[PDB]
Amino acid sequence: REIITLQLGQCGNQIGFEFWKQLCAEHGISPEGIVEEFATDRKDVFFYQADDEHYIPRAVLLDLEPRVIHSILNSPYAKLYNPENIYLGNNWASGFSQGEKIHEDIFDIIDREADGSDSLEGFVLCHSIAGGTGSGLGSYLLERLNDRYPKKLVQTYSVFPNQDEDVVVQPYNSLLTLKRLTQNADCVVVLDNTALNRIATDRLHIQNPSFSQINQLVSTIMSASTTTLRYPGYMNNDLIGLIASLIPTPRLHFLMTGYTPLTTDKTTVLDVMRRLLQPKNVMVSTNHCYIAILNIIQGEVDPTQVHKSLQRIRERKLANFIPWGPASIQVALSRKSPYLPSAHRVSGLMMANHTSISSLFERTCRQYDKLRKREAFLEQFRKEDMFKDNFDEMDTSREIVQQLIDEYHAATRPDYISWG
Amino acid sequence: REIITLQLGQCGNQIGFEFWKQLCAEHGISPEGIVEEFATDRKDVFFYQADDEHYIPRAVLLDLEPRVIHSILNSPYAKLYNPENIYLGNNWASGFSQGEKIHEDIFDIIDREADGSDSLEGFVLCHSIAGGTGSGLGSYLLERLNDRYPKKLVQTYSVFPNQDEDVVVQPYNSLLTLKRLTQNADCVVVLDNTALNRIATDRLHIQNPSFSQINQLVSTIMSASTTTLRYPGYMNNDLIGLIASLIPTPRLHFLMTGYTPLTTDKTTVLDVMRRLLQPKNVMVSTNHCYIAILNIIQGEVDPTQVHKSLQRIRERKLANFIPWGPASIQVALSRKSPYLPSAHRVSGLMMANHTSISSLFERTCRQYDKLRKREAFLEQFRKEDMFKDNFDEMDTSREIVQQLIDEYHAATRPDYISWG
């Protein structure tokens, strides 16, 4: 059903605008919203059911001090959506306080779009971890949505920040935002800028327009994640049916992503299964076994050979898995999307709950603990000081992520029949 | 039956002359009045039944200091009508006093046309709110008709003035004229120059010949409002049967208008129903629900799918409505008018009694109250001072429009079973 998309921060507004351009080019949509002469499919997931099928995206843009929003403005895709839901520092404290002072009218924008919608099923946050203006503001405002609407689902698209540390409060910003992602969000998809830049230098020799290329990558990711909804498929036409298979524990909602064609410039399903089982098709960088793996595929397949593919991949025993419990690898299939150029016809995408991300969390834990012991990298924000005199919110987040690391490592153990 | 049309003021004479050109081009009429070789339909609503069907319009032009009347003169459509019913400042007091001194001979022109007519059913006033020479004179003379003929219907075509305040007595002029519209008129259709200019800048990039374009718009409005009469339809061939459905309260006679094709440079009836249910097809700019909505349509329709359209729009429940009482949306259909070019074959027009106009009234109330408290924007007219030493006519009108605002807001309440 009806899901309202949230874009915020410089990075989040970038991939949100790119993804809306992707869905405008993808379906039979003009740059004005007009249904084209080649448009059928399910068109009410983010698309406003207008009379002449002006499929207006449910896209709420809220930031302050607009820079990239001007670049969004001089475009014909500012005529695709505008139900007047577009709204005009880089620290957690500054963004937090700026979100505090104007929370009411932007939440009125939220409420107007909410009652204007037929239903509400999820909040999709276009974001990046410590995204400058996105950080602080997004954690605050995410707390406002989670308090104000406890009956909805939260998926947060963000990337792991790698800017080669310059802001020195970035582990604090990511730590507090990660606390809010634990307690005010039900799904967080994070990706490594390092591994994506490695794949970009792998397939081609371009790494310099990294923003533009990464918009293509995560726009392919998000269109592939919603393709079973936006084109008539069979299952995971709800977000919640997709989320339920991944999560055995509502604090372990952090998923690894991989994509089977690394070049775009076909063959059977067993082959792409073996490809995706390799960790070099993964977009993300002791012993770690997955909790549950699920794959979406789109392309030209043999409908009987997918049975044979699962049969051979099983009897190969090409993976490990976790001691505690019967899960599986899970196959999901949908159509190859029409009305775009179709190169490398099989494109697969994987969502897996892996314990390897606890090491990445521990890296940020060690960075935060190091800068905390040194205590010269908070820069004494007055907004942070009046917000928290003792800075024990960071201590509480470090406690939360440590409890999650403990849950990760006891889930690696067969004693997750007992407590983790 | 027979309705005599009144055009007065610069604006009212403009759209009246344009509308008479519209009906001359519309029916089989020469610029001399001669019935043409393509002329059947009902031709006695404003058309004098001459022998050789010189369908002379019942058009009474009365003003003083003629400027635009000279532009009406050098035209072949001055030979369409002239039964000698054409007669040769911008304030309410000046126009009021000028209408006072010559009321007798122009009322003799009225009486001569009245007994010359077979019957009398309505006065259609071509006007604009605070139309300069129209204001004051029109309120005075409207009082003369309402006193002199209490058995007739008054419809006043006017537009809400937006000239970006320069005359500073304009809220006083509109306030007194609005008092006369409450107590000496039974129907007032007002339109926002702001929203019409917004639609003009929306469909095209022209806003500079705004007078010429707005003549086309309100001439389409008025021809569409009278099309069921001037072409053989079934119902609302009386004005009063049309007016009766809109009005539950004889002081709430102010109607909102919308028009379904916004471009002219077709499809089913459910679609235009959904279009007209959107507030962007409306020509006019807390919670506000309509009292009663009625629509006229002209075009190529399926006569069974209009049932299906009302069925689907009802079961959609795409609208709210008012607590107190069983009203409905009301469909009305007539022919698409022949002998003109027929582009965008479905053209719909809506009349609705909405409580949102009370906010517009309150805007003018706040403007009048502000200029009254400042008391430097009446300019001390001596005609106004001898007409009213204490200027309590404006106080009484403000009382009247406040009572109407109270009726509007208690009609928003379910307690309009009790008094409003």
Add this chain to the structure above:
Amino acid sequence: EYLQAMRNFFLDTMYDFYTSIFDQNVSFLNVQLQELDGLTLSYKVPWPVDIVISLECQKIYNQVFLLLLQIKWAKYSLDVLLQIHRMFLLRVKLMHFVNSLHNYIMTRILHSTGLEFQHQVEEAKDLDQLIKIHYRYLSTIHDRCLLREKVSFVKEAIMKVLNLALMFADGWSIEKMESDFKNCHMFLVTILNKAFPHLESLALS
């Protein structure tokens, strides 16, 4: 030409004809024509058209003509006007329902089926089949607009609300009308929710 004139110059033009008598006699009808009960009308069909259009067909036309005149009676009596304030509620409360009933009879039956019926009679290739396709419209248009069906469980409300258009016209008490009106209205809505299909247009209103 006669068939087109039938449904357009009776069953408008005849509205004013009825309204002049509304505010009598057998000679008044003729001078008004040449300018809620009773009311004959007389006209002759020529013999080449009388061996297609029956004599009994006039008796069928009279039945529907009477009922439509009663609708115009109640409609025109309420198209002259625009606890103490309770009368205005009784205005909205009734004007609704009479417009719904009128919309039903006019649009849903007499404009759908008649427009199809002209398109069907042009597909008759002879004299005799033209009689048959006509009669298979007559005996069902005589049924669709209520003249033989649910005569005292739906139709009686239409009968009793016609006098409310007179009682409410006089006053131009009030609560003692709406208590009766909402009860018979609710009987009608709770019967029509199971409905032949063309009654669902006013089942909802």
Add this chain to the structure above:
Amino acid sequence: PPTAVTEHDVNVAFQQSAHKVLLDDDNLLPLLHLTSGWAALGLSYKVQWPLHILFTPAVLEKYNV
């Protein structure tokens, strides 16, 4: 089911569910019928019988199960 009231209700609800998106008209062949109401669930359907004897009553009951 009382089997005189619910039969109308299932079809009314079904077409109203269909009106929200995707075939608000065109293809009225499926109509929810009734013979718990899940264990008394039926359906009404129609195919062109002279032009489809591939579908029979037997073939469509097999699909219905």
